[PDB]
Every structure is written in structure tokens, then in C-alpha cells.
Design a protein around this ligand. Structure first.
Ligand SMILES: Nc1nc2c(ncn2[C@H]2C[C@H](O)[C@@H](COP(=O)(O)NP(=O)(O)OP(=O)(O)O)O2)c(=O)[nH]1
Ligand SMILES: [Mg+2]
Ligand SMILES: [Mg+2]
Length: 430
DNA sequence: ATTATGACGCT
DNA sequence: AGCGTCAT
């Protein structure tokens, strides 16, 4: 009753750039704008692997993880942009720099948590309180929410999508109690006003469009962001959760799309998020552990407490390359040359990071995969990172991995290596 | 032969 | 510390 916490204490948004790498390439090359187009890495094997797809191309069935030659079967007029190659490998610097552009704009409105190259969570609780004091009990006009959907509305007592969006928004606004400065629904609405402004600023100042979700926590904001893409934002209220979750497959919730979500489905014999409400917190803890169990018990009621961490910068800086099938590295000279190429890219990125961000990495993590292992990493070893020098880092990485070489011969490497990965970690202020 | 990342939990 | 999971 009155003591049952409802998880309505915060306003959290999730902003995700639409088809990011595609948008970066479309800004640079106007010939690609408003076209079916995709971004690929490499080219010789099956035309390269697609990693980003414009919404026009998605209409033809083009998806990430598809080979470009196969995508061209679905969409013969598909336009392609290739990721830059440097030192023999894909180099994603252009997209990391575009990411910094967007995150610096977002940081003007609120503290952000960088969740990925193109997505960030935003804690808007304080900004909403501020705007509410400025509003002085003034109602919120639909004109302030020109790209907002209200999930679950319209309901009750009409043909085109924009008209639907507007009917739902009018139903939502008409039910608002703009008197109460602590009304959670009002707080979410003001949060959506602020996110409209932030998304407008991103587009004005970068050219990039994004989608967003506004709710009371990170998981609901992420789910909301996905409901109306591209170039739109969605408000998921606490009250919308029972209906939304009643037909939501468990795998759609962040963190349940893998083995744990499959175990929830199989152990409990359920399909949808809402079905979780019928179990006690102790029941869920018994099957999934104390942490997961408490998290599921709260999450299926729309409640989640994970804070938006004040972290705009990545925690690690890493360089990785796969050597699939017959390109695997089978000589010591090969392994050394590629460790050196990865280390030269890492040194470049680390030196720029130190100049921009006043910090230095202190640990080097070396990961490899050997032929025949189905795991991502076959072996992971750390060593000290005391100087931003590529020949030093590559020699140190070789020293920490050289014992994996089964070959009695000094020149050969067996079993050959199908992946190398260098990662700088454990940053300290400098 | 999906690839290049990045976060975080477990023990 | 090193390994596994989740994402994408
Ligand atoms: N190197 C690499 N980059 C990737 C990979 N997957 C994605 N990216 C890059 C390319 C993506 O542009 C970017 C952001 O990933 P999303 O937010 O998951 N996809 P997007 O923004 O394209 O579409 P949406 O409108 O649905 O949000 O990360 C990958 O496997 N490898
Ligand atoms: Mg995106
Ligand atoms: Mg994203």
C-alpha cells in the first residue's frame, strides 16, 4: 500500500544515435543521404561484413552481420561505405570522434553515462525539478513534444501514424495534474520536453538524428527508446508497464537476451516479462541467485535501481583483430608483426587520450584465441603498462603470450592464432 | 569466415 | 587476476 515503493523517484533517458556509422558516412558524403546504404568492414571475403544499415536499406531486409554480397541480393541498389583501414586493420577513429561530438552536446544538459559509442543514459531528475520551478504550474503544450510517443496511448474511443501519435499525446496531456510538482507522470513529461531540446541541439550542431526513451530507470528508458525508431522519442510511464510487459518476450529486456533469459523461460515455463510477477522474491532468488532474483522481482514491476554513472569517457582503450580460417598466424614473425600493428594503433589512441583527458593507462591486457577454441578469448594475461611505446607494448605482449606456442620449433607458431587483442586499462589521473 | 569493440559479474 | 556473459 502506502509503503510499497514504486520506483518513480528518478527521471532517466536513454539517447541512441540512429544507424550511427551510416549517419557519419552520410554527413561526409551527401550522395549517400536518404538512400539504402550500409557500412562494411573489409571487402575481399563476400564483399565485407555489414555493421550498420540505413532504415531505407532495412526495408529490403538488410541487417548487421550480413555479408555485403548477400545484402546486394536483397537490395541491388544498396550503397556501401567502408570503414577505414590502417596498419592492416579496421580503424574506427572517425566514428569515435563523431561520438565525442554528440556526448559533449548531451553533457550540456545533464550528467551522462556513456553506454556505447552511440548511446548514453541521462539522469534528468534535477533538470526536471528546475524546469518545473520555471513552469510555475503552467501546463505543457503538445507543441513542446513534437516527436514524442506516449506508450500505450491512445486507448479507448485515426488512419495515419502522425495522427495516432498526436491522439495519444493529447490523451496523455489531458490527464496530467500539472498542479502537483511531485507527480511522477508530470516529471516524466517535463523530462521528455528536455529530451526534445537535447535531440534538437544534437541535430542542429552535428547533423545527426537520434531516438530516445524517457522513463524512471535505465532498463525502461532503453526499452522505450526502441519502441519508435528512427528520429522519435517515447515516454514509458510507470502505469504503462503492466500492459507493455504482458506481451513482452523476456529476451527483449537488456541482460536477458542470452543464457540467463533462456533459463528464466525454461525453468519457470513462462514467455513474457509480466508473467514474472507471479513468483515471490525468494522463489526467483532460489533459481537465479540473490542478485538476479531481486533484480527480476523488481524489474517485472517496472522498478530498477542501477544509477546513471557519471562517466562520459570509455574505461578501456582496446585494439583487436581476428585472423579467420586460413589467415591465422602460424609463424613467430607473423605474430610479432601483428602485435606491433595493434600496438602502434593503441599507442596513437592512448597518446591522444592522454592529451585530451588528463589520464594515463597503467595495465596492458593481452588476449588471444587459438585455432579450434570456440571461446572469444583462449587466454588473457595482464602486464604493467609503464610507457606509451608501441615496440615496448608489443614486446611485453609477446613475452606474456609466448608460452602458448606448442611448437618445439622456434620459428613456427602452433596452434596458429585466430585473434589478437591489446587493451589498455586501469587509468590514473595525470 | 562475423568483426571490433566495450562493460561488468564471478570466483 | 583470469574467465565468462551480454551486447552489438
Ligand atoms: N566494429 C563493429 N561496430 C559495430 C558492431 N555492431 C555495431 N557497430 C557499430 C555500428 C553502429 O552504427 C554503431 C552503433 O550500434 P547500434 O546502436 O547497435 N546500431 P545503429 O546505431 O547502427 O542502429 P540503430 O538505429 O538501430 O540504433 O556501432 C560490430 O559488431 N562491430
Ligand atoms: Mg544506435
Ligand atoms: Mg547503441
Amino acid at each position: 500500500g502506502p509503503h510499497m515503493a514504486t520506483g518513480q523517484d528518478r527521471v532517466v533517458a536513454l539517447v541512441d544515435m540512429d544507424c550511427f556509422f551510416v549517419q557519419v558516412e552520410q554527413r561526409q558524403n551527401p550522395h549517400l543521404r536518404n538512400k539504402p546504404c550500409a557500412v562494411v568492414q573489409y571487402k575481399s571475403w563476400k564483399g565485407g561484413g555489414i555493421i550498420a544499415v540505413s532504415y531505407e536499406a532495412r526495408a529490403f531486409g538488410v541487417t548487421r552481420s550480413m555479408w555485403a554480397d548477400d545484402a546486394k541480393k536483397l537490395c541491388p541498389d544498396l550503397l556501401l561505405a567502408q570503414v577505414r583501414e590502417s596498419r592492416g586493420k579496421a580503424n574506427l577513429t572517425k566514428y569515435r570522434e563523431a561520438s565525442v561530438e554528440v556526448m559533449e552536446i548531451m553533457s550540456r544538459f545533464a550528467v551522462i553515462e556513456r553506454a556505447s559509442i552511440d548511446e548514453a543514459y541521462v539522469d534528468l531528475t534535477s533538470a526536471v525539478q528546475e524546469r518545473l520551478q520555471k513552469l510555475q504550474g503552467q501546463p505543457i503544450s503538445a507543441d513542446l513534444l513534437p516527436s514524442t510517443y506516449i506508450e500505450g496511448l491512445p486507448q479507448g474511443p485515426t488512419v495515419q501514424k502522425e495522427g495516432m501519435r498526436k491522439q495519444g499525446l493529447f490523451q496523455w496531456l489531458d490527464s496530467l495534474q500539472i498542479d502537483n510538482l511531485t507527480s511522477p507522470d508530470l516529471q516524466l513529461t517535463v523530462g521528455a520536453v528536455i529530451v526534445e531540446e537535447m535531440r534538437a541541439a544534437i541535430e542542429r550542431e552535428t547533423g545527426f538524428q537520434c531516438s530516445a526513451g524517457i522513463s524512471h530507470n535505465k532498463v525502461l528508458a532503453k526499452l522505450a527508446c526502441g519502441l519508435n525508431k528512427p528520429n522519435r522519442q517515447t515516454l514509458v510511464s510507470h502505469g504503462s508497464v503492466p500492459q507493455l510487459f504482458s506481451q513482452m518476450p523476456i529476451r527483449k529486456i537488456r541482460s536477458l537476451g542470452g543464457k540467463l533469459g533462456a533459463s528464466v523461460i525454461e525453468i519457470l515455463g513462462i514467455e513474457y516479462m509480466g508473467e514474472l510477477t507471479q513468483f515471490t522474491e525468494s522463489q526467483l532468488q532460489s533459481h537465479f541467485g540473490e542478485k538476479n532474483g531481486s533484480w527480476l522481482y523488481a524489474m517485472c514491476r517496472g522498478i530498477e535501481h542501477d544509477p546513471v554513472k557519471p562517466r562520459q569517457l570509455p574505461k578501456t582503450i582496446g585494439c583487436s583483430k581476428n585472423f579467420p580460417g586460413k589467415t591465422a598466424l602460424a609463424t613467430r614473425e607473423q605474430v610479432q608483426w601483428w602485435l606491433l600493428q595493434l600496438a602502434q594503433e593503441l599507442e596513437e589512441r592512448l597518446t591522444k587520450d592522454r592529451n585530451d583527458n588528463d589520464r594515463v593507462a597503467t595495465q596492458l591486457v593481452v588476449s588471444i584465441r587459438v585455432q579450434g577454441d570456440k571461446r572469444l578469448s583462449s587466454l588473457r594475461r595482464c602486464c604493467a603498462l609503464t610507457r606509451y611505446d608501441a615496440h615496448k607494448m608489443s614486446h611485453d605482449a609477446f613475452t606474456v603470450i609466448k608460452n602458448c606456442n606448442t611448437s618445439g620449433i622456434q620459428t613456427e607458431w602452433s596452434p596458429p592464432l585466430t585473434m589478437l587483442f591489446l587493451c589498455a586499462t586501469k587509468f590514473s589521473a595525470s
